[PDB]
Amino acid sequence: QPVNHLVKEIDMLLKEYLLSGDISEAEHCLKELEVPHFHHELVYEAIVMVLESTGESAFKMILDLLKSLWKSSTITIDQMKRGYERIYNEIPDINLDVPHSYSVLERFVEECFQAGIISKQLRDLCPSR
């Protein structure tokens, strides 16, 4: 299949963040991509990475990145909503691939709500509930 160059760049950005811990680098690289109508894909891929990870480090790191991106006006409400809704749609299959993903997703969504970055409506739409 042909390369989706932008998916590749978003995955590289997220992996570089998880490996380096450098939130500012991640933010700057996202802005340099200049893809504000594909920020739903950043959100989607970031949450999939949390679901696929082990231990707590990726969960916290991705939480902190999404917190900063929302709070800095880098992701619009529509893009944020669509990223989470895309995860909510695909979670049955993600959960088959990675058991107990419903519970990880629910914890992640609750922590995002506790951080002020998603509406109560969007939290409540999580199918784990």
Curated annotation (Swiss-Prot):
PTM entry text: Polyubiquitinated, leading to its proteasomal degradation. Rapidly degraded in response to mitogens. Phosphorylation of the phosphodegron promotes interaction with BTRC and proteasomal degradation.
GO-annotated molecular function: RNA binding
Effect of D97A: Strongly reduced interaction with EIF4A1
Top-level taxon in the UniProt lineage: Eukaryota
GO CC terms of this entry: cytoplasm; cytosol; nucleus
Expression (tissue specificity): Expressed ubiquitously. Highyly expressed in thymus and liver. Moderately expressed in brain, kidney and spleen; weakly in lung and heart. Expression is up- or down-regulated in response to apoptosis inducers. Regulated by many programmed cell death-inducing stimuli.
Ranges that cross the membrane: none
Annotated ranges, domain MI: 5-128
GO biological process, one term: negative regulation of JUN kinase activity
Entry comment, domain topic: Binds EIF4A1 via both MI domains.
Its biological purpose: Inhibits translation initiation and cap-dependent translation. May excert its function by hindering the interaction between EIF4A1 and EIF4G. Inhibits the helicase activity of EIF4A. Modulates the activation of JUN kinase. Down-regulates the expression of MAP4K1, thus inhibiting events important in driving invasion, namely, MAPK85 activation and consequent JUN-dependent transcription. May play a role in apoptosis. Tumor suppressor. Inhibits tumor promoter-induced neoplastic transformation. Binds RNA.
Assembly, per entry: Interacts (via MI domains) with EIF4A1 and EIF4A2 (via N-terminal domain). Heterotrimer with EIF4A1; one molecule of PDCD4 binds two molecules of EIF4A1. Interacts with EIF4G1. May form a complex with EIF4A1 and EIF4G1. The interaction between PDCD4 and EIF4A1 interferes with the interaction between EIF4A1 and EIF4G. When phosphorylated, interacts with BTRC and FBXW11.
Name the record gives this protein: Programmed cell death protein 4
